Amino acid sequence: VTLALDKDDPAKEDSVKGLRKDIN
Amino acid sequence: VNIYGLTATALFIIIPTSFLLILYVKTAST
Amino acid sequence: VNIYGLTATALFIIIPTSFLLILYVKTAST
Amino acid sequence: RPEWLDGSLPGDRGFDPLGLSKPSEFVVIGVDENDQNAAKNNKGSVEAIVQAGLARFRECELIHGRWAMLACLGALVAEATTGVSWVEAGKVELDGASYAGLSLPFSITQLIWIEVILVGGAEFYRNSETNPEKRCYPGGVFDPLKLASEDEERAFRLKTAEIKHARLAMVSFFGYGVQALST
Amino acid sequence: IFTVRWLAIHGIAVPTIFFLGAITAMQFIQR
Amino acid sequence: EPGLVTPLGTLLRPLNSEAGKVLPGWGTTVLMAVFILLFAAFLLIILEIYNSSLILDDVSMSWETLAK
Amino acid sequence: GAAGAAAAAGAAAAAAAAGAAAAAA
Amino acid sequence: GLPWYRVHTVVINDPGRLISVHLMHTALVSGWAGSMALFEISVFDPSDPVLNPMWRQGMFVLPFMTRLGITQSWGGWTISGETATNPGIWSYEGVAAAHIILSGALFLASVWHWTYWDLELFRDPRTGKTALDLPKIFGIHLFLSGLLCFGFGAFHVTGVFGPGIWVSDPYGLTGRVQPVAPSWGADGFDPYNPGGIASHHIAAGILGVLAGLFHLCVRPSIRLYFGLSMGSIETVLSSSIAAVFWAAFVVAGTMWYGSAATPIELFGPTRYQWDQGFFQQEIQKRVQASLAEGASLSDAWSRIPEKLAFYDYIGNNPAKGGLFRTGAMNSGDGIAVGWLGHASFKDQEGRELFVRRMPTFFETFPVLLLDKDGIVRADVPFRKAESKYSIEQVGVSVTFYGGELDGLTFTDPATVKKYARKAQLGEIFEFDRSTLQSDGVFRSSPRGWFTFGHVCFALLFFFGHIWHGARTIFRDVFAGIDDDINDQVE
Amino acid sequence: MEALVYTFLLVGTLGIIFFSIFFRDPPRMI
Amino acid sequence: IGTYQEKRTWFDDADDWLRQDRFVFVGWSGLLLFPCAYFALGGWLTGTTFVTSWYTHGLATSYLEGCNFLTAAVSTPANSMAHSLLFVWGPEAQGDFTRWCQLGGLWAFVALHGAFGLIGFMLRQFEIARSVNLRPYNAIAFSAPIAVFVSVFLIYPLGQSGWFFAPSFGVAAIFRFILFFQGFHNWTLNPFHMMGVAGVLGAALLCAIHGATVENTLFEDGDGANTFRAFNPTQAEETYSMVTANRFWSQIFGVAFSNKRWLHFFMLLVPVTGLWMSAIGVVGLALNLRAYDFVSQEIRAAEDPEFETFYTKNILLNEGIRAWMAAQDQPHERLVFPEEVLPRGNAL
Amino acid sequence: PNPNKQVVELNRTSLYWGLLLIFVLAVLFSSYIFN
Amino acid sequence: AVTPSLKNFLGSLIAGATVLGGIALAITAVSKFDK
Amino acid sequence: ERPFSDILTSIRYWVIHSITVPALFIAGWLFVSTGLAYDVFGTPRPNEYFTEDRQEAPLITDRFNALEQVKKLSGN
Ligand code: CLA
């Protein structure tokens, strides 16, 4: 349903998962 | 109203108040 | 452990301690 | 080539890339005034130029190399006879004390007390001498075969024999230090 | 003349007139 | 007026002996400046690893270093 | 553009002429 | 006579009273260390190391004893959560006593050096006045420094003879004192590697010995004697105060950013772990490790340690505090008792919802419930007169997984708003505001308090470097300038 | 309770103002 | 030289050229000041004129964009650069100058060369005071602008989530950093800023009083109505009656200076003690150790719905600053607030 | 017989600055200490 | 191996020497022949 | 020698600074009016703030990959 990336995007959005590799 | 702040106020008065009174009455008698 | 006795002990020390220190350091410099 | 060497010495060569044994001049600065009761305190002045330890440096190579010659000759044969690495001694001697396979009765705590009394007091007696040729080369019981009757101040080199073997034994134990942890 | 007093003023004055020509042309950039 | 002589005071006496004595000229100052600039270069190594400004492939530079 | 350089080169040659109009005097 | 701010300069001229006056300061510092360690042991609650650890209780110097191996006590308890069968002599109370016994020994030594100030050691030969050979004195103390540095690194940290330091996992769950091996590659400069600490103190200890042997033998240059004013005992003070604020910025910097020398099981998490979603990502990494292998929700959220969910909480963030919000972190929100579950939010269209967490800046923050793709779907509105994102109309229910409320659902629009405002603070926990009579607003960890002192000290010691460097270079004009000094104009 | 402490600190500050004016160390000329 | 007469090396040939009494003094510090201070001023005047902030901040900050002197700035990097030093050879910029400007790296160009410029200027006035053989009090006073600069521009963002929350170098850009600290830190309430106000606003009083007390107790040393002509700086006597000045304020204000040396040191002391205390408060705000709340008045105002003070009014105004700017002040958060969730009074 | 013996002096104007300083800091900070 | 971040960093310490040397070279050129 | 008032009143100062000073003003005029200032510093022109991909403010949001991302945010 939800990836761990787009669960930490709507909750924190400063996340080290969400910030790196964000050229896509 | 805490035990800290009521006696921290009294120690910050009297320990530097009397220290300055020790040095003044020393000096004013010279 | 009351608010009275913990600071009544500290005032009965420091107010006569420093009073005697005011008179001694006055005297020991003369 | 250096000029402050090459005479009355076994290793008569100017190897020094930097001149560690160079006798340098000295100038003595006066002590700065720190009295508060003066109005001005000055930063001191040049007072005394002084004209000016090769004797001290000769003693200190000789001690290091002779400990190295006891170390290099002692690590090859304890690896040969016993069959344990020279780094492993201490790990296997805390468990069981031995010498050439023969069990010894001493706790490891006693070895601290034995070594600081025996080796320590002998080190306290070596620096109890005030003659730098006697400090480098003593007499007495340490010369049972009488080297001291034989001269070396001329081209005779009867003293220049431990000093080369002291040098590479420090190096071969330095080669043991680059081999122990790394390889 | 290349002295210290010459390099002090013309370190300041030469880019100042360069940017004052730049900022003046920005007043006439409409969009 | 001589000072107070003590057994530890004379054991330590030649350590407080040559006060005020210096080499003439510059001595090892140029040797010092090589060691200052290497340590200035060394402090720029560890400043940028910890800032992730110089990146080494061997380091992790994270709390994930505690794993491996 | 061009007119920002045309009136610029005009006073580049006018102040060169007016700077020489008092330099000849 | 002297002013009040100049009284301690009676010691600048005689070295014997300088021993005696540093001995009294050293007796007071270790006298504080034992007295603070006795105070912290007398108030420490070792019952729950998982959910009420030492950084949660306001312990400041107890994570410094525990950092270098002291894990056991004379009350039976340990830090890892077991009984000490042999506490030894180096307990917490043994070290708290070893600093007080040292405090009285340094006290008596200071009384000795105050009376016997006029030692012959302090007078140099053939001038007879009090003098100190500060280049060699530095060479002695740098030699002892690198000897202790190499001793601490090769023996204490490496575990060759000493116990070792604290090493934990990346996520603060499994942490002990165990020996480390030195790491001599590029990996030793990663400051989250504990092996670089042992590899530091060996390499810096050996070089500090070799540098100490230099400054014992090689006298300084004359041009560098005057230019650094080596003949004064204050040019070593200015350069040492310069050394200790440099150190205090590094020390408070690595405390705030986190390092291998600052574990989070001792000092708490950092503010950059809440901001960058450090524990939240791992909590999601372990749920998705279980939902992919085949498991339920409530059986996957039960497999997460209750200690890991406690790091993922805004109240343990060190930057959610106040300057005069004094005391333990337990005095703010309460003592944590149990993890209350994982609040999962769904609306009436069967869509999951995710509470936008409170950022570290915000004292208050509006509660927002975002979807998978990051679009706000529900909130607790401020104006409720004509709303279009209210929880009441969107129909937000909340279900928990794991914890004390496992398998329990709440659809009441008053109840859901209560747990939505707790879910922006992190994982949901149950506290008690009656054990310590908690205020209700958070505090900062010892990681934040240590950093506050050691940047305020590092900044005030910048000024003391400026003052004491100026009093050496301008020593001759301290009492005023000369009368004919008008030659400095044209 | 704390308002008693607040007024004592305000009365004490106004006391020093009274002594600093009417019992100041008088500037001696020459 | 050195009263032992060695031969001059190339240092002495460099020391006397630097320490030359020319028009502008260079000195040894000028090898640090004049390259760094020219690039802080040159970086600021270039960044306010040409360099955008459309990528780091999502907002225009240069004259070429349309901004004027008040709204143009050299803006901070994005929160995605964390505390990156943003070297132009760095891992973010990687040599390209036109992207280094777009990545806000020209902020850290100004901030670092400005920081080593302040070291170069403070060493300048140790170096001149040792040439002139004065006392070093001009440098010790400049520790307080360095205490302010380091604690705000360097120490504060290192404790926060990045260089983003630094002040940008502008006029309106400082003004939001000021309004950021009210809304988020309640920085008026912090007692270190209160000692910072009383130092700054008390040195302005001492500047205006000592200027006016001197200028109105002058001795009649000339004939004309211009009193500025009746002075020669090589005169040995005071130019104004200190005794009249003392008797004036001892009867107006009740307390006056009688010591001229204590007066001018007190003028030295008040702005320096004021800025060093306020620098400690910004060090406290780097860790968000705020003096935000009086908890005894929050417990009362939550248990009593009619207890209103000017304090609780200030707490409500900070909630207004926080929610209404942070959708645009912090674009890295990517928080969208629907208009019904922001706080709002009646009919505004 | 230490030659480094000095005396501290404190005139009444410095008494009045010192007593004022520790009461004004107590006026300032105790509002935060009592919280 | 060597990363490009280390290549640009070591290139900066070369460029930091050609800057700091050339500032030092300019003050030992004016010191000698006075231009 | 030359104390700042025999320079400004000298005519040889103004036979220099009535030629180099206007040609430097024009050099600053043409640095921006030829659009070169938009290229050197990377500031966007008033028709370059919003491409067709985005109609919002840019957001860098990535540390080590920002160099090629700002090329994609600008639209190049
Ligand atoms: C040898 C005796 C001894 C021993 C074994 C200990 C042991 C301990 N002390 Mg105690 N202490 C002692 C003496 C001792 N102390 C004395 C004499 C004092 C008074 C000064 C204190 C004051 C003291 C305090 C105030 C505290 C301790 C604490 C501690 C504990 C942790 C130490 C720690 O983390 O420090 C960390 C140490 C360092 C980071 C060292 C800093 C040195 C810097 C990095 C070196 C820089 C200068 C150097 C010369 C540079 C050159 C290097 C190279 C080139 C040579 C530990 C149980 C802590 C604790 O938990 O106690 C309750 C604590 O808070 N101690």
Ligand code: CLA
């Ligand atoms: C191969 C051997 C080896 C190894 C693996 C290490 C490993 C390490 N060393 Mg050691 N070191 C060694 C040999 C070694 N060292 C030797 C031979 C020396 C010479 C004696 C040193 C001297 C040394 C020093 C002096 C320091 C280290 C530090 C470190 C750590 C670097 C990572 C870190 O914590 O960064 C963190 C440190 C930094 C990023 C340093 C940057 C310094 C900044 C610029 C200071 C800022 C203050 C300044 C006044 C700026 C103004 C304030 C600002 C807010 C504006 C790490 C443990 C550092 C350390 O212990 O950190 C905890 C440290 O400070 N080492």
Ligand code: CLA
């Ligand atoms: C660098 C030093 C340092 C650091 C970081 C800490 C850190 C800590 N201590 Mg420890 N402590 C220290 C030194 C230190 N301590 C010393 C030297 C003592 C001996 C007096 C103590 C005695 C001590 C006790 C007895 C307790 C703590 C506690 C605490 C914790 C709560 C912090 C707190 O409430 O701050 C409070 C911070 C402030 C109020 C801000 C200070 C700002 C300035 C200094 C105010 C001064 C202004 C003004 C002039 C004062 C006049 C006002 C007047 C009315 C008094 C924290 C872990 C508590 C704890 O949690 O223990 C479990 C606790 O009960 N500490």
Ligand code: CLA
């Ligand atoms: C290693 C640190 C260190 C050392 C040894 C000294 C030593 C000295 N300083 Mg320096 N100084 C330092 C740091 C240091 N200072 C710092 C950090 C600053 C910036 C604030 C200064 C600013 C400074 C000035 C401005 C002056 C000195 C002066 C002096 C001399 C006399 C001090 C005196 O009589 O105080 C007497 C102090 C008192 C009677 C009471 C002070 C009480 C305050 C409020 C502190 C409270 C004590 C507290 C419990 C301890 C906590 C301290 C903390 C660091 C742990 C002496 C040589 C004086 C000097 O050079 O004389 C010519 C002088 O004028 N110092």
Ligand SMILES: CCCCCCCCCCCCCCCC(=O)OC[C@H](CO[C@@H]1O[C@H](CS(=O)(=O)O)[C@@H](O)[C@H](O)[C@H]1O)OC(=O)CCCCCCCCCCCCCCC
């Ligand atoms: C009620 C007000 C509000 C309360 C404020 C509480 C805090 C007060 C803080 C300030 C305390 C005083 C600071 C030091 C003053 C000083 O040194 O003066 C110096 C002068 C010396 O002047 C000389 O005194 C000589 C007499 S003698 O030398 O002192 O014997 C005299 O002959 C000569 O003319 C004269 O020049 O002292 C005097 O003139 C009289 C002695 C003052 C005694 C101290 C008073 C203490 C306060 C008690 C007030 C009641 C408190 C309880 C009720 C609330």
Ligand SMILES: CC1=C(/C=C/C(C)=C/C=C/C(C)=C/C=C/C=C(C)/C=C/C=C(C)/C=C/C2=C(C)CCCC2(C)C)C(C)(C)CCC1
């Ligand atoms: C004689 C003797 C003895 C005893 C000893 C003892 C008992 C000791 C103690 C000691 C002690 C008991 C000490 C203590 C100390 C303390 C201290 C020293 C403290 C200090 C404090 C401070 C310093 C503070 C500061 C501050 C403030 C003011 C506030 C806040 C901030 C700060 C932190 C800055 C015995 C019997 C054993 C035997 C031997 C001999």
Ligand SMILES: CC1=C(\C=C/C(C)=C/C=C/C(C)=C/C=C/C=C(C)/C=C/C=C(C)/C=C/C2=C(C)CCCC2(C)C)C(C)(C)CCC1
């Ligand atoms: C950045 C950078 C760089 C480059 C360059 C530079 C450095 C430049 C500089 C520049 C500069 C240095 C500039 C300047 C400018 C100035 C200006 C722009 C000014 C203006 C002014 C004005 C505008 C004024 C007006 C007025 C007033 C207000 C007063 C008087 C009158 C009048 C009206 C006129 C480098 C390479 C290094 C590196 C990278 C970065």
